[PDB]
Amino acid sequence: MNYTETVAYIHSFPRLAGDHRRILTLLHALGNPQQQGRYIHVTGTNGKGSAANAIAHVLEASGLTVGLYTSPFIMRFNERIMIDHEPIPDAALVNAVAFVRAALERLQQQQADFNVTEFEFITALAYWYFRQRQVDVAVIEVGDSTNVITPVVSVLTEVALDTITAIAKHKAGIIKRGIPVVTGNLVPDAAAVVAAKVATTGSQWLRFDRDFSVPKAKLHGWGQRFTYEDQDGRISDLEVPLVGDYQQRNMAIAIQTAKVYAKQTEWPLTPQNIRQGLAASHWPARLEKISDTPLIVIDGAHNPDGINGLITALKQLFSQPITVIAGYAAMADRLTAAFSTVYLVPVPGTPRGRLKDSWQEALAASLNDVPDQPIVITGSLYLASAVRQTLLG
Ligand SMILES: [Mg+2]
């Protein structure tokens, strides 16, 4: 096939019904690449994509070839599988999809009704591609079809209040015997689930605000300047180009995890690597300022927690009036009460306050009416990625 037939073939996979048998059957046909190499396992309800990207950036700056498996993509499909922050080239995706389909067709010649899902096909391809390219470590963000590895260190960023013990027990399945777990400051029910699991596995548990912390943090331009502290000391005046107070805990989790990786593998990691790797830690479409003149910021906050955390982040950055373009009525009532011009438009991959029929009509209106006013586009990551693909791709 071509690339276009290859990405359409990946999306043609079904919606099957538990354990990891189907993906392990497929992975045995690929020669078990999940059993070789080093891995960092990342799960959590929020902040896992941001942490994983930060861990990868810090490890790459120390001189390691880092594979990175994330979801979702923002600009193109190829962003889900990266090696040193470069998305898997089209032709390499064409080759890899052809190799995995060939092994899958061999498996269907034996077991006639064998199949896998879309995420299981992608995860198996990701794990085979990282071994083919021979990376030093692969940072794996949890989708659990990825739970077929023994990591060097596991990360559990958050189990947020949105049942808690039932969610925490599903998330604690990535914690393995003797392998250290780096977590955030978990809520009581999630913490009790983590404490009992690590007493069972015998794991070293490094927790945010206990073993490591951020004693100083403040805004500095479009990003934050902060100080990290642990048992080895402090690394002061670290800078990341990400706004939001919740990002202080994701970066701190990322720094602690990277240090736990290097100590376990006897790899040298300096504070310089951590500093340089945190400076390169850009995470697209998450309060990203994409244009200076005119001022345009894109964001994918989609819950009311995301709307409330955005509102105070926008208040921190802007003391002038802005136009906010929003992709239900409780999310829109807090936007109208806090901001100037507010436009409600439709999100592009969905179906059926000032109303606009599209985000382009709202953006053209604001630029025509008041050209010096900043525009923030928020409400969905799919709407935010549509604006980013249009305005930059
Ligand atoms: Mg993510």
Side-chain angles (χ1 to χ4, degrees), residues 1-14 16-18 20-161 163-302 304-327 329-332 335-351 353-381 383-393:
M1 282 165 300
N2 38 67
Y3 167 76
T4 322
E5 275 157 10
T6 282
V7 185
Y9 163 68
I10 280 166
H11 296 140
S12 294
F13 276 100
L16 308 189
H20 337 280
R21 195 105 276 127
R22 264 174 298 121
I23 200 180
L24 276 186
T25 292
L26 184 51
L27 283 159
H28 174 263
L30 296 182
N32 292 305
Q34 88 281 359
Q35 319 207 122
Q36 334 174 262
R38 318 194 124 134
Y39 304 93
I40 296 177
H41 217 172
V42 193
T43 192
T45 65
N46 298 290
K48 42 156 184 339
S50 203
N53 178 56
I55 289 161
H57 264 306
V58 159
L59 286 180
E60 274 160 32
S62 76
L64 292 156
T65 293
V66 186
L68 180 62
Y69 187 41
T70 47
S71 191
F73 62 91
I74 300 281
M75 309 285 282
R76 252 185 135 228
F77 184 73
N78 306 45
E79 294 180 344
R80 307 194 35 164
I81 304 178
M82 278 173 190
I83 300 218
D84 292 340
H85 287 80
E86 275 300 317
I88 167 145
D90 296 2
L93 184 51
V94 157
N95 280 340
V97 161
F99 194 83
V100 181
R101 135 139 197 241
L104 171 58
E105 269 169 10
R106 241 113 47 70
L107 288 186
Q108 292 178 152
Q109 242 212 112
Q110 287 129 45
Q111 254 134 53
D113 276 40
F114 181 74
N115 224 317
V116 287
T117 67
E118 175 186 329
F119 190 75
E120 270 162 0
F121 183 82
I122 291 162
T123 304
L125 198 141
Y127 278 140
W128 179 85
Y129 185 62
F130 293 150
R131 283 292 95 219
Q132 179 202 64
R133 305 292 294 187
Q134 287 173 289
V135 307
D136 297 311
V137 64
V139 183
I140 281 92
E141 154 170 58
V142 147
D144 215 305
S145 331
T146 71
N147 213 359
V148 286
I149 60 176
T150 286
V152 172
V153 42
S154 309
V155 178
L156 211 156
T157 67
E158 196 50 38
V159 173
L161 287 145
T163 151
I164 304 294
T165 306
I167 293 154
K169 262 145 91 212
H170 283 138
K171 254 94 199 94
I174 68 146
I175 298 173
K176 316 269 161 95
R177 314 178 64 108
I179 305 309
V181 56
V182 181
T183 77
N185 207 42
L186 307 163
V187 289
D189 279 351
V193 163
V194 174
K197 178 54 162 266
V198 303
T200 283
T201 66
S203 293
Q204 173 192 8
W205 176 26
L206 300 184
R207 142 129 115 135
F208 182 59
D209 272 321
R210 167 176 100 204
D211 311 283
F212 63 99
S213 60
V214 179
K216 277 117 120 354
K218 85 213 144 233
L219 209 106
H220 176 236
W222 192 272
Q224 302 163 254
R225 147 173 313 172
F226 72 103
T227 284
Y228 168 84
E229 198 190 305
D230 64 4
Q231 81 185 273
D232 300 333
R234 320 180 118 203
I235 305 170
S236 44
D237 293 335
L238 275 164
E239 243 136 25
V240 63
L242 301 172
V243 199
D245 305 317
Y246 57 93
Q247 302 271 201
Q248 281 155 226
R249 60 100 187 171
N250 291 158
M251 285 321 93
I253 275 169
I255 286 153
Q256 177 74 104
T257 300
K259 285 183 67 163
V260 161
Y261 177 77
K263 220 192 233 261
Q264 245 29 57
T265 59
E266 262 54 62
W267 182 245
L269 183 71
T270 70
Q272 230 341 101
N273 297 153
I274 297 175
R275 226 171 250 281
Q276 183 197 121
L278 251 13
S281 294
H282 291 277
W283 196 226
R286 269 73 159 217
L287 228 130
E288 170 182 27
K289 168 161 76 75
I290 61 177
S291 177
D292 216 69
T293 288
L295 225 158
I296 291 154
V297 176
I298 50 146
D299 185 67
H302 67 290
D305 236 299
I307 282 336
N308 279 291
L310 165 62
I311 274 157
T312 50
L314 275 191
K315 251 44 141 100
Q316 268 162 237
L317 301 153
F318 302 102
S319 52
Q320 348 126 46
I322 60 173
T323 299
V324 158
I325 292 162
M331 291 213 303
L335 285 163
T336 44
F339 304 100
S340 237
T341 349
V342 168
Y343 288 130
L344 315 159
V345 306
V347 174
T350 332
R354 195 86 272 168
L355 265 130
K356 297 288 135 204
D357 308 306
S358 95
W359 63 265
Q360 286 112 151
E361 189 195 6
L363 170 62
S366 185
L367 278 181
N368 204 88
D369 281 1
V370 266
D372 320 306
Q373 183 155 300
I375 298 128
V376 170
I377 285 121
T378 194
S380 173
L381 197 60
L383 156 66
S385 117
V387 168
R388 201 190 196 276
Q389 272 156 351
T390 299
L391 305 175
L392 301 187

